[PDB]
Scaffold this motif. Structure first.
Motif, PDB file in Angstrom:
ATOM      1  N   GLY A   1     -29.583  10.769  14.402  1.00  0.00           N
ATOM      2  CA  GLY A   1     -30.311  10.157  15.633  1.00  0.00           C
ATOM      3  C   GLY A   1     -31.826  10.436  15.611  1.00  0.00           C
TER       4      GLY A   1
ATOM      5  N   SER B   1     -28.782  16.306  24.857  1.00  0.00           N
ATOM      6  CA  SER B   1     -28.565  14.882  25.478  1.00  0.00           C
ATOM      7  C   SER B   1     -29.489  14.621  26.679  1.00  0.00           C
TER       8      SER B   1
ATOM      9  N   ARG C   1     -20.694  12.433  18.421  1.00  0.00           N
ATOM     10  CA  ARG C   1     -21.061  13.753  18.571  1.00  0.00           C
ATOM     11  C   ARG C   1     -19.652  14.212  18.326  1.00  0.00           C
TER      12      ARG C   1
ATOM     13  N   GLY D   1     -26.126  10.540  26.111  1.00  0.00           N
ATOM     14  CA  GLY D   1     -27.234   9.521  25.955  1.00  0.00           C
ATOM     15  C   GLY D   1     -28.389  10.424  24.839  1.00  0.00           C
ATOM     16  N   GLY D   2     -29.344   9.844  24.400  1.00  0.00           N
ATOM     17  CA  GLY D   2     -30.317  10.791  23.439  1.00  0.00           C
ATOM     18  C   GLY D   2     -31.311   9.804  22.941  1.00  0.00           C
TER      19      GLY D   2
ATOM     20  N   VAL E   1     -30.258  11.878  29.988  1.00  0.00           N
ATOM     21  CA  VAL E   1     -30.191  10.594  30.628  1.00  0.00           C
ATOM     22  C   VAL E   1     -30.863  10.620  32.122  1.00  0.00           C
TER      23      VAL E   1
ATOM     24  N   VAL F   1     -36.041  13.403  27.899  1.00  0.00           N
ATOM     25  CA  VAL F   1     -35.423  13.380  26.627  1.00  0.00           C
ATOM     26  C   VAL F   1     -36.388  14.021  25.721  1.00  0.00           C
TER      27      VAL F   1
ATOM     28  N   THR G   1     -26.244   1.053  28.492  1.00  0.00           N
ATOM     29  CA  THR G   1     -27.207   2.268  28.306  1.00  0.00           C
ATOM     30  C   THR G   1     -27.998   2.173  29.395  1.00  0.00           C
TER      31      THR G   1
ATOM     32  N   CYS H   1     -28.574  14.246  17.663  1.00  0.00           N
ATOM     33  CA  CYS H   1     -29.558  13.577  18.448  1.00  0.00           C
ATOM     34  C   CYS H   1     -28.801  12.324  18.734  1.00  0.00           C
ATOM     35  N   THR H   2     -27.565  12.125  18.755  1.00  0.00           N
ATOM     36  CA  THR H   2     -27.130  10.687  18.851  1.00  0.00           C
ATOM     37  C   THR H   2     -26.916  10.294  20.223  1.00  0.00           C
ATOM     38  N   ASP H   3     -26.141   9.409  20.640  1.00  0.00           N
ATOM     39  CA  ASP H   3     -26.105   8.620  21.863  1.00  0.00           C
ATOM     40  C   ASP H   3     -24.546   8.236  22.183  1.00  0.00           C
ATOM     41  N   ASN H   4     -23.620   8.901  21.638  1.00  0.00           N
ATOM     42  CA  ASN H   4     -22.248   8.616  22.190  1.00  0.00           C
ATOM     43  C   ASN H   4     -21.425   9.740  21.681  1.00  0.00           C
TER      44      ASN H   4
END
Ligand SMILES: [Ca+2]
Ligand SMILES: [Ca+2]
Ligand code: NA
Ligand code: NA
Ligand SMILES: [Zn+2]
Ligand SMILES: [Zn+2]
Lengths: 65, 234, 240, 66
Positions: C35, C150, C132, D65-66, C152, C189, C181, C125-128
């Motif tokens: 990520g 993570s 993960r 999220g990231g 948000v 972040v 998103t 460092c991903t987003d879903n």
């Protein structure tokens, strides 16, 4: 009985912050102190009396950046 | 704001606490960042990305190889060039739509006072007490909020000082190497505090936050004004 | 290491906790960053600056203008270009003396397993959730430490999970494979990803520090809390 | 008896499991994790874990999220 830098230790009632720091031989230059999570200005150390159960923190200034 | 700014800042405009009016406020603001090293470079990068309208970058050093371990805005090809100029150049590449002013000098005396005067918030990202005391004196006198942080080794300290200085100032509190991400986390948090203060987000101030990067713990202490303070005591 | 490395890493080498020995271990290590977004770009910048010998940078996206508000490694000139390629190019500018490997892909299955096996530590460092969970499953099966974070809005979450997995794994805490998103503040972040780099340096240089702790950040109240993780008896991943 | 729930004081019956308490508060379990006295309590234990007087409980959602 107080917490000094998160560690229990015994003290002596009616003693000032200054009195306490003197007995522990701690440098007061570049040092700040908090009691129960609130800073105690240095100019108040001579008069501020440590109370039973007080949670004391003694730390050094960091100026680097 | 124009279409290009809307897309560019869309991910924070989506936040109801910032939104269109909050972003416009950042775009109308001016931030003075004093010191472009471990603390100042991440802070300037985040503030430029966030859309602060004008960033004034002050530093009188040149880039040195040993700087690269923590001053993330620089590159090996910048070695021996003036930091404020290189910063201005790199930040422009990130965001060419805001105003970036570079001051190649040791901001002091009258010049420090004019810059603090024009700033809505000042970020103290310097590395020595004499300079931090002089910046703190100028901020209180000019009634400008000051966000100050420091780091050394695995430790960091940060405080947000704002008018009417109810919890005092830097002078009330204060009368080896460093690990890159520890100073980096402190500078990034300085940017976060500035965004909140400029956009009007309610948040605490007047607290000293301490970070021990080795035990991975944080502690917050309530600052207290010193009655005898030569700067904010009256 | 050579003389150029000595100068470059000098401010880290001065620390007795790292010193010449610790720097050599960083220089001999390999880190996989999955990520290259708000978490991944500062983590990669700091890890590169720190002298981690090999960084593998995996991401399947191209740079977009809206990325710049938080992905500090990129610039307006990189818009529309592949993230892993741009990252590899920008990072070699910072530090041309380490090995920088670009994987422009959504790591999964066999390719994920092979990258996890080669890395000494993995930064998620991903987003879903689905990705993960896949990374966590690979790290536990291949006995490779996993540093995950993570963020948000104004909030952040971070945990360091290491073998023998005494406090469980990501799946012990989150049984979910999907959220139930949005916007995000750049520096929030950013602080989580920078903290991921910090945990990596400590793990790779051998600095005694806690692990198996969930760290939660509220960027609005400016408060952190640390919660002790606990393995789940029926965990299908580390349950054994 | 009395507990702290997400840093706020609240009263609830004695002898209740985490599941029953979350049900009483109308809280969704999917995507949530819970800590009691600063230690995570795995969701697989909520149907039997008894909440005790003076417990400090945090119920929060996963951020992916990231
Ligand atoms: Ca005053
Ligand atoms: Ca040393
Ligand atoms: Na001003
Ligand atoms: Na591995
Ligand atoms: Zn003062
Ligand atoms: Zn598990």
């Amino acid at each position: 009985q107080i917490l000094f830098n998160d560690q229990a230790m015994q003290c002596a009632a009616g003693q000032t912050v200054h009195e306490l720091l003197e007995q522990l031989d701690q440098r007061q230059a570049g040092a700040a102190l908090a009691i129960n999570q609130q800073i105690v200005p240095r100019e108040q150390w001579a008069q501020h009396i440590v109370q039973d159960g007080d949670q004391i923190l003694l730390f050094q200034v960091i100026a680097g950046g | 704001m124009n279409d290009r700014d809307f897309m560019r800042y869309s991910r924070q405009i989506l936040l109801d606490d910032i939104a269109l009016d909050g972003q416009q406020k950042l775009l109308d603001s001016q931030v003075l960042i004093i010191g472009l090293g471990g603390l100042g470079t991440p802070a300037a990068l985040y503030l430029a990305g966030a859309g602060v309208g004008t960033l004034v970058l002050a530093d009188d050093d040149d880039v040195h190889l040993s700087n690269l371990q923590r001053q993330i805005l620089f590159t090996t090809e910048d070695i021996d060039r003036p930091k404020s100029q290189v910063s201005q150049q790199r930040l422009t590449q990130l965001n060419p739509d805001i105003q970036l002013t570079a001051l190649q000098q040791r901001l002091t005396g009258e010049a420090l006072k004019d810059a603090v005067a024009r700033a809505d918030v000042v970020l103290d990202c310097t590395d020595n007490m004499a300079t931090r005391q002089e910046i703190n004196a100028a901020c209180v006198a000019l009634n400008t909020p000051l966000i100050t942080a420091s780091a050394v080794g695995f430790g960091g300290q940060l405080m947000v000082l704002t008018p009417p200085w109810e919890q005092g100032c830097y002078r009330c509190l204060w009368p080896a190497g460093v690990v890159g991400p520890v100073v980096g986390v402190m500078g990034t948090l300085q940017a976060l505090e500035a965004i909140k203060l400029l956009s009007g987000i309610e948040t605490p101030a007047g607290e000293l936050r301490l970070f021990d990067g080795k035990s991975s713990q944080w502690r917050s202490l309530a600052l207290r004004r010193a009655s005898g303070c030569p700067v904010c005591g009256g």
